[PDB]
């Protein structure tokens, strides 16, 4: 069973994670470097799966295979604390997240039932250059670890982790970054989700949020009402011509944080060029024609389980927001208006980077879920949320 708190986790004994090159939960880290040296010979054979299951690298270019992955995640991926909502990553979103520049087919690591061919497990890696304190490292980002509900608590997650580690090691990469809602050895940083109601009536109806102690429904709606149009001058969707300046603005802005991505210009195009129902980016082009700011949020809806009338929650997630002339609070205020305009029910954001300067003023409510950040085979001091400058899908 998984722990949600550093104090409840420190009671626990980590059978799998004790074997891994990550620091112990209790120990304090005053060093900067790999937990273990790079390996110069790597196991050539895939790790043994339980009887009746086989490895299968998923070609997400095949529409049918992509649909299989959608279904596995739609039915077996992350749920809330109370089993009321589940992530509903779209097929198109999964392509965006899993085929960035440098993606590899063998890093789309799935598990299939031998007889039926049913997809029952998945884990993924994508390449990413990561700046951690004073070191820049080629790493991978691990994401979408999923074991079918009927396969849980059978030690299948550790063989998925070890197999993707083997396949990443084969490409000469020995560090990784990943997040989780549970506590594991050992978080480099702990971030908290905050939520901004956009359609507060639907949220309360489906029990995503709740009426505050002494507030009517009519009052909750007036509180969360937003303008129909953003206020910032020159705000417009990102275009192809904005790719270099967006890359420039992002690269300089991220320097103030201690855990950041380092994106090429092609990676900036992939992660920020707007795709409807996936990623939205708006730039601020001023009176001189100069792009000075940009905001971005990605689309991640959720399934509402066991509700006869409301089936889906449309959530927007704060991505990367860079300000150099427009105040961050004005920038994020326009993000809320834009999200409201696009039919989103809620706008989610973490307390990382400078987000705490605007969360309360813009009527975000603190969430019940922490997002722990972890590094694999890298030792470094932990950092506060405001020093985390990395957002994953």
């Amino acid at each position: 069973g998984p722990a949600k708190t550093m104090e409840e986790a420190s009671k626990r004994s980590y059978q799998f994670w004790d074997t891994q090159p990550v620091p112990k939960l209790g120990e304090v880290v005053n060093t900067h470097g790999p937990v273990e040296p790079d390996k110069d010979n790597i196991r050539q054979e895939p790790y043994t799966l339980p009887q009746g299951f086989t490895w299968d690298a998923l070609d997400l270019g095949d529409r049918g295979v992509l649909k299989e992955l959608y279904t596995l995640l739609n039915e077996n991926y992350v749920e809330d604390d109370d089993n009321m909502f589940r992530f509903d990553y779209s097929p198109e979103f999964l392509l965006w997240a899993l085929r960035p520049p440098g993606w590899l087919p063998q890093w789309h690591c799935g598990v299939r039932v031998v007889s039926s061919r049913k997809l029952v497990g998945f884990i993924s890696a994508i390449p990413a250059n990561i700046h951690i304190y004073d070191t820049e490292k080629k790493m991978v980002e691990i994401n979408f670890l999923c074991v079918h509900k009927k396969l849980r608590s059978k030690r299948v997650a550790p063989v998925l982790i070890r197999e993707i580690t083997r396949r990443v090691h084969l490409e000469g990469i020995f560090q990784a970054v990943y997040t989780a809602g549970v506590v594991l050895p050992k978080p480099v940083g702990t971030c908290r989700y905050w939520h901004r109601s956009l359609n507060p009536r639907k949220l309360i109806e489906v029990k995503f949020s709740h009426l505050s102690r002494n507030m009517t429904m009519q009052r909750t709606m007036k509180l969360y009402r937003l303008p129909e149009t953003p206020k910032t001058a020159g705000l417009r969707p990102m275009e192809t011509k904005d790719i270099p300046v967006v890359h420039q603005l992002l690269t300089r802005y991220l320097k103030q944080f201690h855990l950041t991505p380092v994106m090429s210009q092609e990676e900036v195009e992939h992660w920020f060029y707007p795709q409807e129902n996936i990623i939205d980016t708006f730039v601020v082009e001023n009176a001189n024609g100069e792009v000075t700011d940009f905001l971005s949020f990605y689309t991640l809806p959720s399934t509402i389980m066991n509700h006869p009338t409301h089936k889906s929650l449309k959530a927007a997630y704060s991505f990367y927001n860079v300000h150099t002339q427009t105040p961050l609070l004005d920038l994020m205020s326009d993000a809320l208006v834009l999200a409201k305009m696009k039919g989103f029910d809620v706008f989610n954001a973490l307390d990382l980077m400078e987000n705490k300067t605007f969360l309360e003023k813009l009527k975000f409510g603190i969430g019940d879920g922490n997002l722990q950040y972890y590094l694999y085979n890298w030792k470094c001091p932990s950092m506060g949320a405001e020093k985390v400058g990395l957002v994953l899908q």
């Binding site: 909502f85 979408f144 939520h195 995503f208 949020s209 709740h210 603190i366 969430g367 019940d368």
Partner: peptide, 8 residues
């Protein structure tokens, strides 16, 4: 992977 949060 991620974490599904909802307001406390």
């Amino acid at each position: 992977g991620g974490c599904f949060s909802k307001p406390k």
